[PDB]
Amino acid sequence: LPLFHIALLVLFMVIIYAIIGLELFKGKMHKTCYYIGTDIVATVENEK
Amino acid sequence: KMTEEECRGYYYVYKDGDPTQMELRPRQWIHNDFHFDNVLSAMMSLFT
Amino acid sequence: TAKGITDYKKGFSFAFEQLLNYNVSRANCNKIIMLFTDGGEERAQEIFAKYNKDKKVRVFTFSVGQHNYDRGPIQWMACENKGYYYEIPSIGAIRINTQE
Amino acid sequence: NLQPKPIGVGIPTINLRKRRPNVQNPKSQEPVTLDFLDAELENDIKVEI
Amino acid sequence: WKPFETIILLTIFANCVALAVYLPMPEDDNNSLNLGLEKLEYFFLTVF
Amino acid sequence: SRTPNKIDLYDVRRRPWYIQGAASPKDMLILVDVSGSVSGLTLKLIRTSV
Amino acid sequence: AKDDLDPEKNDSEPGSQRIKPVFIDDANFRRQVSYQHAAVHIPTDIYEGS
Ligand SMILES: COC(=O)C1=C(C)NC(C)=C([N+](=O)[O-])[C@H]1c1ccccc1C(F)(F)F
**Chain F contact for D26, CB < 8 A?**
yes
Q: How far is G1 from chain F (nearest CA, A)?
A: 10
**Resolution to 1 decimal place, in Å:** 2.7
Query: Would the CB of B48 count as within 6 Å of ligand 1?
Result: no
Sign of the Cα pseudo-torsion (E1, E2, E5, E6, in order): negative
Q: C64 forms bridges with which residues in the sheet? A: C88
Task: Name the residue type at position B6.
Answer: E
Query: Would the CB of B47 count as within 6 Å of ligand 1?
Result: yes
Give dist(CA C90, CA B36) in Å, integer.
29
What spacing in Å lies between the alpha carbon of B44 and ligand 1's midpoint? 11
Q: Which atom of ligand 1 is nearest to the CA of B43?
A: 7
Q: D13-21 — which CB contacts under 8 Å span 24+ positions?
A: D16/A37, D16/A38, D17/A37, D17/A38, D17/A39, D18/A38, D18/A39, D18/A40, D19/A38, D20/A35, D20/A38, D20/A40, D20/B15, D20/B21, D21/A35, D21/A36
Give dist(CA B11, CA B28) in Å, integer.
10
Q: Please name the helix (run of DSSP H) or strand (run of DSSP E) that holds residue D39, with its range, or none.
A: helix D36-39
Which phi and psi angles does C58 have, rounded to 5°?
-115, 135
C-beta separation of C61 from C78 below 8 A: yes
CA C52 to chain centre: 13
Experimental technique used to determine this entry: cryo-EM
Annotated binding site of F for a divalent metal cation: 33, 35, 37
Supply angle C-alpha E38, E32, C69, rounded to 5: 125
Supply angle C-alpha C42, C44, C46, rounded to 5: 145
The two beta strands, C58-64 and C84-88, are parallel
C-beta separation of C66 from C88 below 8 A: no
Q: Please name the helix (run of DSSP H) or strand (run of DSSP E) that holds residue F48, with its range, or none.
A: helix F41-49
Chain D: residue whose CA lies nearest to B12: D23
